[PDB]
């Protein structure tokens, strides 16, 4: 619900025809990799200007038993550092 409510700022989901300025719906994000001592961060990349271009389907099915629900999400990015 939060990812879709974020995408809703880029272009309104439902019956509205609206969407906010790029300064509003763009966000910063950070990826980290830890050492094998779980305390310690050894590499850290910021990603600038995420927004969710595609929030994946959830393929629900009565035969799909014994898995937890997962979905893919595809962000656009401007650069990373």
């Amino acid at each position: 619900k939060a990812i879709i409510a974020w995408q809703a700022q880029a272009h309104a989901q439902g019956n509205d025809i609206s969407g906010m300025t790029p300064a509003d719906y763009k966000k910063v994000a950070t990826v980290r990799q830890f050492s094998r001592d779980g305390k310690t961060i050894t590499n850290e990349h910021t990603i600038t200007g995420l927004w969710p271009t595609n929030v994946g389907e959830v393929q629900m099915d009565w035969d799909s038993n014994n898995e937890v629900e997962t979905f893919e999400t595809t962000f656009a990015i401007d650069w990373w550092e």
């Binding site: 966000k27 910063v28 950070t30 600038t48």
Partner: peptide, 14 residues
């Protein structure tokens, strides 16, 4: 701390 640093930096970069 990282949240407040990243958001306000993103703002001032504008």
């Amino acid at each position: 701390r990282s949240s407040f640093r990243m958001e306000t930096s993103q703002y001032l970069a504008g």
